[PDB]
Design a protein around this ligand. Structure first.
Ligand SMILES: CCCCCCCC/C=C\CCCCCCCCCCCCCC(=O)N[C@@H](CO[C@@H]1O[C@H](CO)[C@H](O)[C@H](OS(=O)(=O)O)[C@H]1O)[C@H](O)/C=C/CCCCCCCCCCCCC
Ligand SMILES: CCCCCCCC/C=C\CCCCCCCCCCCCCC(=O)N[C@@H](CO[C@@H]1O[C@H](CO)[C@H](O)[C@H](OS(=O)(=O)O)[C@H]1O)[C@H](O)/C=C/CCCCCCCCCCCCC
Lengths: 207, 207
């Protein structure tokens, strides 16, 4: 149930408190265990791992790492020339990309983007999310692994069904709750991308 | 370095002490982080997860769960009709299959099985291991994911190189240490398979 854990709104100064953020996004990886296939469990674990790494660094000193901007600027100072490919900065660099993937996927579904010829699939939505969020950073083996995983994707009706877990709500109602979640989720992700740009903390290497 | 953590020999009564076993096989999953690609990290984590689950159950009562046979017979009693698809029995059911995969792969390399036309690849060895250990239990998406991952497989020379980490030893020496490790490793795995048969604890479902 996405809109039961809305993200906070951005404050005027656009600084994101680390503790609240981590707590919010930590409700996202489990969803990957209700998409119908064990092919997604490794994906839960990849995104959780990013979250766990940021929390581990935050837990060393919450006041020093109070906001996400604090994390980047502090680690830049701590690590010198190995930064930004170290620590929580690297974990959040990759986290923002998974989060962005989810954002683009959910927004595509809610904007009614679909394959007219195969309308209860979610493949076009996942393929667009992947091209926007992830593909730039994956070598061809991983891109092939994505293309294989796409076939385990559930039908759209089943996917919406699992997002409400059985609430007996119309798809229309379901999509409206998703639109609501997307408000502060997109705004937050955009601010994390903008901070990576302003700090020159973004790297373009492929895996 | 495989032969620095040899498995114990089997005792006369062919009972495998749980603590020692777990400690031994826990040196195996890290190796997946030195094969040259992030495609294997999810694999480290899948096998570690099986090991972690068995240890978690063992830690509740070491004396009740002293041997692997103890685990199966105790859980059969604890869980009734959900057994063998529960608890440490299910974790070890899947563990033995990963361990068997590694065994068949290493033994194939050491027996000189190779593609004459592509002699410094390890693909035929991985494909045989997969067919012997795993394929029976994978649906076609996962089989496709395996076929994609096969392309991240290192060259044989690099793989042997990483097993000695840089020891300046001939491949011949390397393979002889692997043959030595394989003695008590194969014997132990075979006893775990035989216990699954004798207990009727083996399930054939696909993922
Ligand atoms: C709430 C709604 C849910 C929305 C989702 C519904 C979608 C359903 C639709 C379609 C299904 C199709 C598949 C969808 C795929 C979903 C993708 C979600 C986003 C995933 C994000 C992946 C990010 C990524 O590429 N990561 C990559 C980079 O990770 C980072 O690497 C860094 C070093 O360069 C660091 O190590 C870093 O670690 S840390 O310590 O700094 O934290 C670490 O996190 C990571 O390598 C890729 C992971 C994906 C797995 C690819 C490999 C799979 C191998 C499979 C092998 C199996 C073969 C075995 C056969 C028996
Ligand atoms: C020391 C020497 C090292 C030797 C290895 C060198 C090999 C190098 C050669 C070639 C490389 C080619 C790939 C090689 C593959 C190696 C395979 C190693 C053995 C792996 C064993 C897999 C076992 C397996 O199939 N497991 C399956 C069943 O697991 C069990 O499921 C149970 C329920 O039915 C339980 O949940 C159970 O959990 S527990 O709680 O009870 O413990 C759990 O462990 C498991 O589903 C399969 C895992 C493999 C990953 C497949 C999915 C990958 C998805 C990738 C998605 C990425 C897409 C994202 C794109 C951005």
């Amino acid at each position: 149930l996405l809109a039961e854990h809305l993200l906070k709104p951005l404050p005027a100064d656009k600084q994101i408190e680390t503790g609240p953020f981590l707590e919010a996004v930590s409700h996202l990886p489990p969803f990957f265990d209700c998409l119908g296939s064990p092919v997604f469990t490794p994906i839960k674990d990849v995104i959780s791992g990013n979250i766990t790494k940021i929390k581990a660094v935050y837990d060393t000193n919450p006041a020093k790492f109070r906001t996400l901007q604090n994390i980047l600027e502090v680690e830049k100072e701590m690590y010198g020339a190995e930064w930004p490919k170290v620590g929580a900065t690297l974990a959040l660099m990759w986290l923002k990309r998974g989060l962005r993937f989810i954002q683009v996927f959910l927004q595509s579904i809610c904007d009614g983007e679909r394959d007219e010829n195969h309308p209860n699939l979610i493949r076009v939505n996942a393929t667009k999310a992947y091209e926007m969020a992830l593909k730039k950073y994956h070598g061809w083996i991983v891109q092939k692994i994505f293309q294989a995983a796409l076939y385990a994707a559930p039908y759209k009706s089943d996917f919406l069904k699992a997002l409400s877990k059985g609430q007996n709500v119309t798809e229309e109602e379901c999509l409206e709750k998703i639109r609501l979640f997307l408000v502060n989720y997109t705004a937050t992700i955009d601010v994390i991308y903008e901070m990576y740009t302003q700090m020159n903390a973004e790297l373009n290497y492929k895996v």
